[PDB]
Amino acid sequence: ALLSFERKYRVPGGTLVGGNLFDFWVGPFYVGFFGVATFFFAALGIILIAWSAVLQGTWNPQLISVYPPALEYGLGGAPLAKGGLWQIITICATGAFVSWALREVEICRKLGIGYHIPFAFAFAILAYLTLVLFRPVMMGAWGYAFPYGIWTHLDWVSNTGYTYGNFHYNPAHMIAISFFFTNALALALHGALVLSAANPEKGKEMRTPDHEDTFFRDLVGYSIGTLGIHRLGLLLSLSAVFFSALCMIITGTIWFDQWVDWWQWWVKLPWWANIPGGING
Amino acid sequence: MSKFYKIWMIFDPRRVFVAQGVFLFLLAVMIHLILLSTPSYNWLEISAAKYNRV
Amino acid sequence: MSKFYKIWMIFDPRRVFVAQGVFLFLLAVMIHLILLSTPSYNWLEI
Amino acid sequence: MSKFYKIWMIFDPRRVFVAQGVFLFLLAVMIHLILLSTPSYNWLEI
Amino acid sequence: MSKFYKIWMIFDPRRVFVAQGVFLFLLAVMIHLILLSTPSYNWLEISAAKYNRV
Amino acid sequence: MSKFYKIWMIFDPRRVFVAQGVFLFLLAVMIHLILLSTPSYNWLEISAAKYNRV
Amino acid sequence: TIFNDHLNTNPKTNLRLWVAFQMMKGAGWAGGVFFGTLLLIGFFRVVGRMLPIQENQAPAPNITG
Amino acid sequence: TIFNDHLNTNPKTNLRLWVAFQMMKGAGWAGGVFFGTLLLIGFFRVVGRMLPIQENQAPAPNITG
Amino acid sequence: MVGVTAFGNFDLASLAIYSFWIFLAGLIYYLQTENMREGYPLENEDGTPAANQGPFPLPKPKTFILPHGRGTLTVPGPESEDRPIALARTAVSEGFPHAPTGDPMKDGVGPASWVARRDLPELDGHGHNKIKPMKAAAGFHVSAGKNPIGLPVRGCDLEIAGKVVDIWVDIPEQMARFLEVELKDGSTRLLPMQMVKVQSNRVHVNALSSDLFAGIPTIKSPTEVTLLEEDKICGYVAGGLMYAAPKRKSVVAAMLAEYA
Amino acid sequence: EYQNIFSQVQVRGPADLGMTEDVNLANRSGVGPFSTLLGWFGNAQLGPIYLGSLGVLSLFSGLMWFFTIGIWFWYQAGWNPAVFLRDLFFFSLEPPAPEYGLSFAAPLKEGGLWLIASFFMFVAVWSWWGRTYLRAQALGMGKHTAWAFLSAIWLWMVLGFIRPILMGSWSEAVPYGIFSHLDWTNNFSLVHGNLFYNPFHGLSIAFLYGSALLFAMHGATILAVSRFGGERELEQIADRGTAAERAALFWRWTMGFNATMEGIHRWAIWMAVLVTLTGGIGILLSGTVVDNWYVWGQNHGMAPL
Amino acid sequence: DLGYTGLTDEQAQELHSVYMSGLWLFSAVAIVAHLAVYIWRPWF
Amino acid sequence: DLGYTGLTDEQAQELHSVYMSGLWLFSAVAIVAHLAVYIWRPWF
Amino acid sequence: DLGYTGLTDEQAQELHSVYMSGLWLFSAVAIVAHLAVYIWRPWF
Amino acid sequence: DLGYTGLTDEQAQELHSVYMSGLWLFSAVAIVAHLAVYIWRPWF
Numbered sequence A: 001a002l003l004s005f006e007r008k009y010r011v012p013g014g015t016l017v018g019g020n021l022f023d024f025w026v027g028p029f030y031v032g033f034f035g036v037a038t039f040f041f042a043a044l045g046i047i048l049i050a051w052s053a054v055l056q057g058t059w060n061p062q063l064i065s066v067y068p069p070a071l072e073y074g075l076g077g078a079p080l081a082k083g084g085l086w087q088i089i090t091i092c093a094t095g096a097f098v099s100w101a102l103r104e105v106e107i108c109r110k111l112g113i114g115y116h117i118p119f120a121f122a123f124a125i126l127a128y129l130t131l132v133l134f135r136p137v138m139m140g141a142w143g144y145a146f147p148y149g150i151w152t153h154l155d156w157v158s159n160t161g162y163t164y165g166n167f168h169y170n171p172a173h174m175i176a177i178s179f180f181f182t183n184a185l186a187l188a189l190h191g192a193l194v195l196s197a198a199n200p201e202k203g204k205e206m207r208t209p210d211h212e213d214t215f216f217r218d219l220v221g222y223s224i225g226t227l228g229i230h231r232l233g234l235l236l237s238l239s240a241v242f243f244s245a246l247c248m249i250i251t252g253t254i255w256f257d258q259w260v261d262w263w264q265w266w267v268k269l270p271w272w273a274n275i276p277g278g279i280n281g
Numbered sequence B, E, F: 001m002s003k004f005y006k007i008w009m010i011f012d013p014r015r016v017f018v019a020q021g022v023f024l025f026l027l028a029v030m031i032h033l034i035l036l037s038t039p040s041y042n043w044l045e046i047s048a049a050k051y052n053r054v
Numbered sequence C, D: 001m002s003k004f005y006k007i008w009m010i011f012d013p014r015r016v017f018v019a020q021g022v023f024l025f026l027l028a029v030m031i032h033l034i035l036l037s038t039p040s041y042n043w044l045e046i
Numbered sequence G, H: 001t002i003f004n005d006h007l008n009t010n011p012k013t014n015l016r017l018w019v020a021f022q023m024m025k026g027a028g029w030a031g032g033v034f035f036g037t038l039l040l041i042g043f044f045r046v047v048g049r050m051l052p053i054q055e056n057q058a059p060a061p062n063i064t065g
Numbered sequence I: 001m002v003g004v005t006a007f008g009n010f011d012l013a014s015l016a017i018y019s020f021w022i023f024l025a026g027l028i029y030y031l032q033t034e035n036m037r038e039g040y041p042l043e044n045e046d047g048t049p050a051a052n053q054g055p056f057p058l059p060k061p062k063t064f065i066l067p068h069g070r071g072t073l074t075v076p077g078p079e080s081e082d083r084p085i086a087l088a089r090t091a092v093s094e095g096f097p098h099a100p101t102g103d104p105m106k107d108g109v110g111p112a113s114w115v116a117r118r119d120l121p122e123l124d125g126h127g128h129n130k131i132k133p134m135k136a137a138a139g140f141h142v143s144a145g146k147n148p149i150g151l152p153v154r155g156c157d158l159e160i161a162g163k164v165v166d167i168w169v170d171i172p173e174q175m176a177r178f179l180e181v182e183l184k185d186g187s188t189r190l191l192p193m194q195m196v197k198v199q200s201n202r203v204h205v206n207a208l209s210s211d212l213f214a215g216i217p218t219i220k221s222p223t224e225v226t227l228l229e230e231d232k233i234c235g236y237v238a239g240g241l242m243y244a245a246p247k248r249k250s251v252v253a254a255m256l257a258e259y260a
Numbered sequence J: 001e002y003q004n005i006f007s008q009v010q011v012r013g014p015a016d017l018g019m020t021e022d023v024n025l026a027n028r029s030g031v032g033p034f035s036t037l038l039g040w041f042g043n044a045q046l047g048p049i050y051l052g053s054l055g056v057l058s059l060f061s062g063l064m065w066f067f068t069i070g071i072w073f074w075y076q077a078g079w080n081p082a083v084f085l086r087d088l089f090f091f092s093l094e095p096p097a098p099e100y101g102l103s104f105a106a107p108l109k110e111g112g113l114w115l116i117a118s119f120f121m122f123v124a125v126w127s128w129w130g131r132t133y134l135r136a137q138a139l140g141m142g143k144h145t146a147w148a149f150l151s152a153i154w155l156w157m158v159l160g161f162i163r164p165i166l167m168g169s170w171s172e173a174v175p176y177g178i179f180s181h182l183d184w185t186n187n188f189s190l191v192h193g194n195l196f197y198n199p200f201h202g203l204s205i206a207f208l209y210g211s212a213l214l215f216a217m218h219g220a221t222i223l224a225v226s227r228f229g230g231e232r233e234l235e236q237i238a239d240r241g242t243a244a245e246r247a248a249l250f251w252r253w254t255m256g257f258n259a260t261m262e263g264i265h266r267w268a269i270w271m272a273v274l275v276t277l278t279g280g281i282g283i284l285l286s287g288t289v290v291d292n293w294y295v296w297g298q299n300h301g302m303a304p305l
Numbered sequence K, L, M, N: 001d002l003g004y005t006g007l008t009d010e011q012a013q014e015l016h017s018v019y020m021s022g023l024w025l026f027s028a029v030a031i032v033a034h035l036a037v038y039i040w041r042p043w044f
């Protein structure tokens, strides 16, 4: 039912809409107005994906695919069987994600903590909306969004990437990839450091934050601190997602050619554009 | 069947009614969308074939 | 059906009315999209 | 512009508000009719 | 069989009834969708063929 | 075999019964789906062929 | 409030306007959300119009048939 | 009125709902008139549909050009 | 070894993927088991153990040997909270809020809650006290940014309830922790830095108003702060966000309240 | 609202030389300068760094690896500083051609230098791993960092050493160069069918996305409860406070389950380690067992045909 | 008398009556609109 | 007497009776709609 | 006699009896539906 | 100071202020609608 310590926190108030209409729990889950909304949307979306499985003709979970409308439909509606189910599922998913963020706001708010978590979830929501809503609308058709399938949206990724050659040459792409790799590195180092401090050589006393700073300063020579590492983690993840959204919003919209052709500008800069030798020329 | 009423000594009416309303609306939307998906029972397309809208 | 009124001894009117307004507007917008999706009954074509 | 408020020391609010509601609805119906008349902007097509 | 009732001294009725309702609805949706998927027992298509709709 | 009952001085009945219910339902769904997958023992297709529904 | 010309209406109509108001709070918020979403989509559609997407134009990423 | 849960709102919002109400009286009456007129026209259009006007059909009374 | 199968389509790709599924199930079980070391067993809203304990059993206990001779903490263990909670349940059924019986902030329930930790200061690695006022620390000086010492302190109601005297810093960590804010009562209160907005002429506190500055739990000794009283101060300052919402002069709050 | 993203006022004093158990301080250097720029985000102190036997070994090997690649880049530009400036991202130190196989008979100019630089890189990375282990040991801490680094090293070794040996060719390792190693990645994907249909590739991507997810979640949670001293985590493990409880209750009321101040770091370390663990397994299977992953997916219920 | 909200019988009846008057007004406007649309263009 | 929600026997019976009246009203409207659709276009 | 939920013997029997009455009602409706479908179109 | 209606200065200012708040709300909704239509299909 309740954690040993949970009861002193289960108080009324701190909710955006609906007073105490839905200000109650179902098991551990806090419900709220936006919890009601998000349960509705999630349930409807999962059901409509199952109905897509029925219409398509497979029950293999890895072959179920809900394709967006084809290019000729433009930005209008499509029949449910050939593109409309995708649109309804997209609306359901957007509503579910937004309601989840607002429910998180309500919970953060009943507990008296900052709103960093719904903040950071909004970044992922905006990346999803970039892929599904902003770019296809800016670009003319719902057919540029990805299908809802486990292995068929990877086909969308591959086709979109190879439309512009090697997508590795997108520069915002490189920045986003560097942020992702740095984020994974920092997460591994942080988890390892805290665990090694709390679980020392075996039977000797528990370590202190001073030991963590000492270890990492011995390793490379500059410890960032606990507050520093948590700030850096939030910012690395958010920067990665932001640059992903940027690299995809500019693709097919202001850049239409091979991306190495973008990299071509530095090579042609006046004070080396003509020299013989090297890779280029 | 006579004493099914004691379910309300088990369940709080407020939570049950909220859940029931959500469930009923979701089920109705389910069935309407299923009907709209099939070429028949998609009453829209059927009436458009009746009155020559295409 | 006569004593449905006791629902208001269960539910606070303010919250119910806000929720009902939100629900009704959302449902109307929904149905407009359903009509807009079909080639007939779509009034934004022209 | 600042002291336009004294219009209400001239006009009774009740009557003005009834007249204004009637006028605004009639004007909206009018314009929806002008749009409906032209072959374009006639949304009731299809 | 006679003393199966002691299951309720093991399980809280509220949780069991919520789980049972969810399970029963999910199973019914499962079977209905399975029937709708097959060309036969998809009662919709079968009727649409019977009454010469499509 | 007579004193197998001492398993219940090892295991809490609540957790065991929940796990057993989940396991039994999952196994039954497993076997039914395996039967449905094969062209024979897919009782649906077999009946449809028997009464010529296609 | 010094106006004292609206206070003469009966209490029942005061209740009436109170709940008309409750519902327009609720669904005025909902309308603000929906129409702000449409304005966002319209901004992106205009930016798409002014860019030369409409001349060099990408092939379909996914089959859809 | 025994409800006594709406009376807690401030007098300014009471004034607000009072005049929202004034305007919906005025133009709800206007809307009733307009839509009743459309329903009358629709009744006559249906009666015209069900009659065989649509098969034997009169020439234009006036030139209009 | 490209493409020979042991049976059906089963090859090393398939063997590896199924082995990983099994390993992932085991790892998820282990991770949840490690995370069941605080707050369990579960309990009803009236304190008695629940019929629920979950599919995951409790792990075997492990012992942390605390540094500086503080003792040992062994988990999971018997958890009580060694303090009375002033709440009264709203409904007889479960999953409903418990309303405060008296003043909520100040009995310490809800967002104003606190936990009975050890009434001792946490120590740095070398044994000294970890957190310390500027005067008690040797060599520390405000190094960048707007020095808050000497500025007035304004509450959420746009009154000034005191003004800043000193900064409490965290020695090894080299970062400011509390504002020692002194009132024209003459006694001093502690302000968490993450609850204060240091401006050019003014230290703004969105959490509290002037009349609530006096209520902040004071410190036992005047150069040190213990863990208990840090909870106590932090919980009150933070619970001020909901429980001092009425007294607050926010444009958007008054906006919405006048509409509501 | 103050968001705790940047410090708003800084303090400093005497430098902290660090703890002194079982550590030979003859090898620890002196503390460096304080950076006001780095102080707005975390600690401002730089140094002191420990310089041991493995430290010198790793520094020598890594410096020679970097220098060897640089000298090849200079040769490859014709010794022209402007060409070096303009083609810095296009230069490449490429492994021997397939016809040499695994032999060390490749001439200096189609891959002898690649082999030399690779030897230096091998020594540098393994020395750094040993140094991580010993730095953890000297302070009496656990060896968790060494094992996470070992996962990263596993992926690195598979990419450069083990897979070329299994395929019997040095030509299938990764060239040293920015755009060249990106093209190596793309061409590896092209040659073996989609890596998108490699299941371990998909798992690796799942755990990289999960790393970004979990670490945004955890940074946001700790910054949200830093008003109760939540960033001081070792002490919250030692003596649980209200920050830990509020964090646990937020996540419990949000998604039905929570963690501990201690246990979220077990989640974090495993989430980050599984990236390179599954990646190494996938790359090792790639080409050795499967050479067309899309067909494999068709055969395994993954692709439609 | 459950009294979750605290209202009495007479208050409940009064509020429900004014609600239902509003509900039937809304329903009447909806029926007029539906008849107008049906006459304009049927969907059956 | 088992009690979890706080309601008594008479309260339970009253609430269940008004629920069931609402349930049968909903069911009757559903049956009328189903008959209308079936007559308009059968699915059997 | 366990006592994990707090119910006694008589409470358990009463709750189980009303459950089983509901269960057999559900089962009877299911059997009627199954016979109707089987007669309409057999699956064996 | 004519007072054909009978209102004073403060009453006039209060009524005019609430009117103008309503007027600007109406105007804002109109501007949003006009921008939506213009983006959808321009008339210039």
Ligand SMILES: CCCCCCCCCCCCCCCCCC(=O)OC[C@H](COP(=O)([O-])OCC(O)COP(=O)([O-])OC[C@@H](COC(=O)CCCCCCCCCCCCCCCCC)OC(=O)CCCCCCCCCCCCCCCCC)OC(=O)CCCCCCCCCCCCCCCCC
Pocket (backbone or CB within 6 Å): A195, A199, A200, A201, A202, A203, I015, I016, I019, I020, I022, I023, I024, I026, I027, I030, J141, J142, J143, J144, J147, J148, J150, J151, J154, J269, J273, J277, J281
């Ligand atoms: C009986 C019937 C048969 C059944 C068979 C099936 C069995 C099913 C099992 C299902 C799974 C159950 C749960 C598993 C996870 C458990 C984790 C755990 O318990 O943590 C406790 C424990 C917690 O320590 P602590 O309490 O915090 O320390 C306190 C002490 O004071 C301070 O202590 P300390 O500081 O000294 O730390 C020491 C310890 C603690 O480690 C940590 O601190 C955590 C670090 C996490 C990262 C570790 C991964 C590093 C990867 C190394 C290289 C990767 C590439 C290997 C090649 C890939 C495989 C081909 O270090 C390690 O244990 C890691 C050693 C890694 C060596 C790997 C060598 C190659 C693989 C050989 C397999 C055996 C490995 C060792 C097993 C025995 C260990 C004692 O941590 C561990 O022991 C880690 C367990 C390592 C497991 C194996 C690692 C690799 C797994 C490979 C998966 C491949 C799947 C198959 C796909 C391909 C197939 C073809």
Ligand code: BCL
Pocket (backbone or CB within 6 Å): A157, A181, A184, J125, J152, J153, J155, J156, J159, J184, J185, J186, J188, J189, J194, J195, J196, J200, J201, J204, J205, J206, J208, J275, J276, J278, J279, J280, J282, J283
């Ligand atoms: C067209 C290109 C192909 C493709 C080809 C490949 C190939 C080929 C590989 C990956 C790999 C990976 N790809 Mg892929 N990839 C594609 C599409 C994607 C997409 C996407 C959305 O489209 C994503 C998210 C990913 C994501 C990923 C990662 C999950 C994974 C790498 C883990 C990692 O961190 O490695 C980076 C980490 C390391 C390499 C470890 C380094 C460790 C050593 C110790 C570091 C030493 C440092 C050295 C000494 C320098 C010192 C510097 C100084 C100290 C400053 N790929 C497509 C299908 N991808 C790898 C993998 O594991 O696949 C299974 C891999 O080999």
Ligand SMILES: COC(C)(C)C/C=C/C(C)=C/C=C/C(C)=C/C=C/C(C)=C/C=C/C=C(C)/C=C/C=C(\C)CC/C=C(\C)CCC=C(C)C
Pocket (backbone or CB within 6 Å): B025, B028, B029, B032, B033, C030, C031, C034, G015, G016, G017, G019, G020, G023, K018, K019, K020, K021, K022, K023, K024, K025, K026
């Ligand atoms: C995808 O599936 C589709 C959408 C295609 C088909 C699915 C359709 C769904 C399932 C249909 C669901 C419909 C829902 C259930 C209909 C519910 C409607 C609700 C009940 C309408 C209730 C309206 C209540 C009215 C607005 C109440 C008004 C109360 C008054 C405002 C209070 C004051 C009344 C006084 C002022 C006197 C009256 C005069 C005035 C001006 C109101």
Ligand SMILES: COC(C)(C)C/C=C/C(C)=C/C=C/C(C)=C/C=C/C(C)=C/C=C/C=C(C)/C=C/C=C(\C)CC/C=C(\C)CCC=C(C)C
Pocket (backbone or CB within 6 Å): B024, B027, B030, B031, B034, C003, C004, C006, C007, C009, C010, E025, E028, E029, E030, E032, E033, K002, L014, L015, L016, L018, L019, L021, L022, L023, L026
């Ligand atoms: C994909 O699968 C498909 C869709 C093809 C097939 C799906 C099949 C599924 C399984 C269908 C599931 C159907 C479910 C099981 C049907 C359930 C129906 C019943 C349970 C719904 C009940 C409705 C009753 C409602 C309308 C109650 C109305 C009563 C209100 C009007 C007020 C009453 C509330 C209280 C008691 C009144 C005031 C109390 C006072 C005394 C204080």
Ligand SMILES: COC(C)(C)C/C=C/C(C)=C/C=C/C(C)=C/C=C/C(C)=C/C=C/C=C(C)/C=C/C=C(\C)CC/C=C(\C)CCC=C(C)C
Pocket (backbone or CB within 6 Å): B004, B005, B006, B007, B009, B010, E017, E020, E024, E027, E030, E031, E034, F025, F028, F029, F032, F033, L002, M014, M015, M016, M018, M019, M021, M022, M023, M026
């Ligand atoms: C691919 O797989 C396919 C689909 C082909 C095959 C799948 C097969 C699976 C395995 C089928 C699984 C079937 C399951 C096992 C069937 C289970 C049926 C039973 C267990 C469900 C129970 C139904 C009983 C319900 C309707 C109870 C109703 C009683 C309520 C009306 C009120 C009673 C509740 C309490 C006791 C009353 C008040 C208590 C008082 C004393 C306070």
Ligand SMILES: COC(C)(C)C/C=C/C(C)=C/C=C/C(C)=C/C=C/C(C)=C/C=C/C=C(C)/C=C/C=C(\C)CC/C=C(\C)CCC=C(C)C
Pocket (backbone or CB within 6 Å): D030, D031, D034, G021, H013, H015, H016, H017, H019, H020, H023, N018, N019, N020, N021, N022, N023, N024, N025, N026
């Ligand atoms: C054939 O010629 C055509 C039609 C083509 C072109 C001709 C166009 C004609 C000439 C254009 C004429 C336009 C007229 C002049 C425009 C006049 C518009 C009037 C002035 C608009 C005024 C609106 C006043 C608003 C509705 C006032 C509202 C006052 C409130 C109802 C009072 C309380 C305020 C509350 C309800 C709102 C905010 C507070 C809450 C509780 C939401």
Ligand SMILES: COC(C)(C)C/C=C/C(C)=C/C=C/C(C)=C/C=C/C(C)=C/C=C\C=C(C)\C=C\C=C(/C)CC/C=C(\C)CCC=C(C)C
Pocket (backbone or CB within 6 Å): J066, J067, J069, J070, J071, J073, J074, J115, J116, J118, J119, J121, J122, J156, J157, J158, J159, J160, J161, J174, J175, J176, J177, J178, J181
């Ligand atoms: C002016 O600047 C100067 C010239 C002074 C210095 C500047 C230098 C700059 C230009 C250096 C540039 C360096 C490049 C850009 C670094 C790029 C590195 C690339 C990105 C590395 C990527 C992958 C490499 C990994 C996969 C290598 C893995 C190989 C390991 C597994 C070790 C291999 C084991 C070898 C084959 C064993 C051979 C043993 C002996 C007997 C040969």
Ligand SMILES: [Fe+2]
Pocket (backbone or CB within 6 Å): A194, J222, J233
């Ligand atoms: Fe942490």
